């Protein structure tokens, strides 16, 4: 409890780790260690009754996150691992169930069958793009098809449990933790033209409450980079 | 020179042979390998992970996330069925599109067992009981709570634990996995009484698959271009 | 019954992936096919269970012929010889049948006459990376990744023909070898629409029924 990293300190109280492997280190590249490893906390989203989902593309959320995000423009290459803490704080009078998946190389699908979605629809900086419970019509030129039962990938949304995941059940559980290694085909990549991870949160059983309780539940995502190293001079 | 003799089946192309072949690009010196996490050696370890089952198809929930949620409400009748689905394979049953059920469609004969995990996604203040009966092949679907009790069953108390596992063989009547109200749902004040139940499926032991074929779920008329 | 579900017993199968015809005298007839597995729907669904693949390649060409109707006067022709040129990724590419890009020394080709065993050839793992990436969330145009580009194949007659037009059709068989697969992935549910991208139209989760009981 009450772990710290640099000048940031969170407190916790089981951890599912990657594919059984731990994040480890690799011209001659050197590493940043003091300037980077701290808990970057994205702002909280509100889980209402008519919610559908959220997703964050992972090396895009920390693009404007300060002294890690200023390292993005000075460096052309690099490899990174992550550790994600997701916690929603409801009472013992609310009910629901979330699924917290982390998808490597999650290509999204456009709404028009001939184009490909524009950059402002794939990911916003530290803002959650949110799923929809309808179809996006084909008259939209460059928009991501956000049918939540296909998860934007053309697949069955129940079979998303093959990735590393954790079920947040409000009856029994309170938070989630995910340790994700560096998964890529090349050892160092372009970091402006590649989002090699995607964190989704999908409410399978929707929120319900009685009249008098709070009409929302906030979900707080905390990302901590591990094994951050770059190719440079 | 040396005397040789050509047998029948010589200048033919059997599409499933294992012969040597001359390399098109020698002297190329390909890229050496790399430790990438998550290597797969067999298809059965993709089958042995959990996956949510759409037990609530019901002709209008299939284009929604409501296909997975089994509804529970505090009724007034003494004993009543919650759900029930057969285990007859192929004939559009609910275990078909899952993560295990689409790997078994690449094979002609298979045999093994099934882990069926349930999860009560309701309030933390609620209390109830359920039956989980399994009718073996030969016995009919039980038409009452009482004769469903006399078979193989697990009494699932919700307030004690929130997950109950029922292992069951599956092979290529054939079975039923019905579930019954034992008691009602007792709830405090200012707590909602309409709860849900999810259901996961997996493979318990190792299966036995033979005679690989092609799946019926994907087809084609024209080339993709 | 234990080894039938392994990776090599799943993917090392031969499959027809392309089929084209070409005439000799037309000055438009010569074949062309870029090597990718995204044309046929039954091979694409097996390779898209995994994110990163790494395999050798092995191709076989079944070439036949036909006698297109000529004018008259005693068509008798000798045997025909075909050329199958492989262009490595980042090489010259022909624009006509008669071109200097056929004769280049770094594009390996096979020659074969009619009436023998079909011309097999094998290509190793040719990529700068360490795995072919079936799914690429990023830009190079969205989701393309020119790093897994396996090359191009071109086919033509080498015999100059005078009395009779002859058209020939070639079927290419495709076989992975020594397959390695990483990072499994759920199987596709919707139908495939295009080749390059992963676009779709939304579909139901399963086949429906009347009641939950």
């Amino acid at each position, epitope marked *: 409890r009450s772990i710290t990293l640099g000048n940031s300190t969170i407190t916790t109280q089981n951890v599912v780790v990657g594919y059984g492997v731990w994040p480890e280190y690799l011209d001659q590249p050197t590493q940043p260690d003091v300037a980077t490893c701290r808990f970057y906390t994205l702002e909280s989203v509100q889980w209402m009754k008519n919610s559908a989902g959220w997703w964050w593309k992972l090396p895009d959320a920390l693009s404007q996150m300060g002294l890690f995000g200023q390292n993005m423009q000075y460096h052309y290459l690099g490899r990174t691992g992550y550790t994600i803490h997701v916690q929603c704080n409801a009472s013992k009078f609310h009910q629901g169930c979330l699924l917290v998946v982390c998808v490597p190389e999650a290509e999204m699908g456009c709404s*028009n*069958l*001939n184009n490909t979605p524009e950059f402002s629809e794939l990911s916003g900086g530290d803002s959650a793009r949110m799923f929809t419970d*309808t*179809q996006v*019509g*084909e*008259s939209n030129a460059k928009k991501v098809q956000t049918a939540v039962w296909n998860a934007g990938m053309g697949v069955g949304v129940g079979n998303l449990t093959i990735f590393p995941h954790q079920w947040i059940n409000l009856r029994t559980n309170n938070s989630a933790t995910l340790v994700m290694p560096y998964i890529n085909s090349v050892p160092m990549d372009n970091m402006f033209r590649h989002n090699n991870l995607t964190l989704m949160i999908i409410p399978f059983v929707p929120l319900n409450y009685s009249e008098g309780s709070s009409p929302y539940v906030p979900i707080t995502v905390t990302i901590a980079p591990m094994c951050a190293e770059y190719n440079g001079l | 020179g040396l005397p040789v003799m050509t047998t029948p089946g010589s200048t033919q192309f059997l599409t499933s042979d294992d012969f040597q072949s001359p390399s098109a690009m020698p002297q190329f010196d390909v890229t050496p390998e790399m430790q990438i996490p998550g290597r797969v050696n067999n298809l059965m370890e993709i089958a042995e992970v959990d996956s949510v089952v759409p037990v609530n198809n019901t*002709e209008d929930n*299939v*284009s929604s996330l409501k296909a997975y949620q089994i509804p529970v409400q505090s009724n007034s009748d003494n004993g009543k069925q919650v759900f029930g689905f057969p285990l007859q394979p192929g004939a559009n049953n609910v275990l078909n599109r899952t993560l295990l059920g689409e790997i078994l469609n690449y094979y002609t004969h298979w045999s093994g067992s099934i882990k069926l995990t349930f999860m009560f996604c309701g309030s933390a203040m609620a209390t109830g009981k359920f039956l989980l009966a399994y009718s073996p092949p030969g016995a009919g679907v039980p038409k009452n709570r009482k004769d469903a009790m006399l078979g193989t069953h697990v009494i699932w108390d919700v307030g004690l634990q929130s997950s109950c596992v029922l292992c069951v063989p599956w092979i290529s009547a054939a079975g039923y996995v019905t579930c019954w109200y034992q008691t009602n749902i007792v709830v405090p004040a200012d707590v909602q009484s309409s709860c849900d139940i999810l259901c996961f499926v997996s493979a318990c032991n190792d299966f036995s698959v033979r005679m690989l074929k092609d799946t019926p779920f994907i087809r084609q*008329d*024209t*080339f*993709y*271009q | 019954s234990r080894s039938e579900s392994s990776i090599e017993n799943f993917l090392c199968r031969s499959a027809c992936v392309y089929y084209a*015809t070409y005439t000799n005298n037309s000055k438009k007839g010569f074949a062309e096919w870029v090597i990718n597995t995204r044309q046929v729907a039954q091979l694409r669904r097996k390779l898209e269970l995994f994110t990163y693949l790494r395999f050798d390649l092995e191709l076989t060409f079944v070439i036949t012929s036909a006698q297109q109707p000529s004018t008259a006067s005693s068509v008798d022709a000798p045997v025909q010889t075909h050329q199958i040129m492989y262009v490595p990724p980042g090489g010259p590419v022909p624009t006509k049948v008669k071109d200097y890009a056929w004769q280049t020394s770094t594009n390996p080709s096979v020659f074969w006459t009619e009436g023998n065993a079909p011309p097999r050839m094998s290509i190793p793992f040719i990529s700068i990376g360490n795995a072919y990436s079936c799914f690429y969330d990023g830009w190079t145009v969205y989701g393309i990744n020119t790093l897994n580009n396996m090359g191009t194949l071109y086919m033509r007659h080498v015999n100059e023909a005078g009395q009779g037009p002859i*058209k020939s059709t070639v079927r290419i068989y495709f076989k992975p070898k020594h397959v390695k697969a990483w990072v499994p992935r759920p199987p596709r549910l919707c*139908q*495939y*629409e*295009k080749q390059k991208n992963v*676009n779709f*139209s*939304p*579909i*139901g989760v399963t*086949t*429906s029924r009347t009641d939950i009981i």
Partner: antibody
Framework: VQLQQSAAELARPGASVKMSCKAS????????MHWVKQRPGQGLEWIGY????????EYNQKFKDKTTLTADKSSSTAYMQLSSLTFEDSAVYYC???????????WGQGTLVTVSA | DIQMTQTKSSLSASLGDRVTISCRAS??????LNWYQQKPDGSVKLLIY???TLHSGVPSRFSGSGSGTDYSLTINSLEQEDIATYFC?????????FGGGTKLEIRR
């Protein structure tokens, strides 16, 4: 493996016509069914489509206020209703099955709708 | 939209010769063209589903070509059964637009 439509009809201007296009030979709730209008003077004109697995329809802007494409899973048919007929609404209507995202592989036989008094 | 212009709308030739029907777009449609054939009794079917590749079951007397805006069809040996009406349709933008018809007729 083929589609079947209804028969040709007749209606007064101001009334409503409803056609059908019954599909058989495949899983009906996989592929989207379209509707194309052929006026005898010009070429074909697109109307819209219906995704049968979700009942989501999307019309061309020239025919948005009138047509209503419905479908039913039981008899595996698909309908189109034309409201507020005018003298320009006399044409031949086809139903297609769009596959591979642009290619209409299977067509119907077409029903002739005329408006008269 | 894209207005496909089949400017002729009436061809005439004998049997055995080479006929070309042309479809001209309004902008670049990037090799996404389809060629359909409507018989006079009403039955419509797809012939060519790109610029230049044939549908399965359609004989090898048909061929297509083109790049950018201008596109073309070719029938090298005209037969009796090929007397029908022809359309072109692009598959690039929304909504789908069809070209005008083109009726063939025997010359003399």
């Amino acid at each position: 493996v083929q589609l079947q439509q209804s028969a040709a009809e007749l209606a007064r201007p101001g009334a409503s016509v409803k056609m059908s296009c019954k599909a058989s030979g495949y899983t009906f709730t996989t592929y989207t069914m379209h509707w194309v209008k052929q006026r005898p003077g010009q070429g074909l004109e697109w109307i819209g489509y219906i995704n049968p697995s979700s009942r989501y329809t999307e019309y061309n802007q020239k025919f948005k206020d009138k047509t209503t494409l419905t479908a039913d899973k039981s008899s595996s048919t698909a309908y189109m209703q034309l409201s507020s007929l005018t003298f320009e609404d006399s044409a031949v209507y086809y139903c297609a099955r769009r596959s591979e995202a642009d290619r209409f592989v299977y067509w119907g036989q077409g029903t002739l709708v005329t408006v008269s008094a | 939209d894209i207005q496909m212009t089949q400017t002729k709308s009436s061809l005439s030739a004998s049997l055995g010769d080479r006929v070309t029907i042309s479809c001209r777009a309004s902008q670049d449609i990037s090799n996404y063209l389809n060629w359909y054939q409507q018989k006079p009794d009403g039955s419509v079917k797809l012939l060519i589903y790109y610029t230049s590749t044939l549908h399965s079951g359609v004989p090898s007397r048909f061929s297509g070509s083109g790049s950018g805006t201008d596109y073309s069809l070719t029938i090298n040996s005209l037969e009796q059964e090929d007397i029908a009406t022809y359309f072109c349709q692009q598959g690039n933008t929304f909504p789908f637009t069809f070209g005008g018809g083109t009726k063939l007729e025997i010359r003399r």
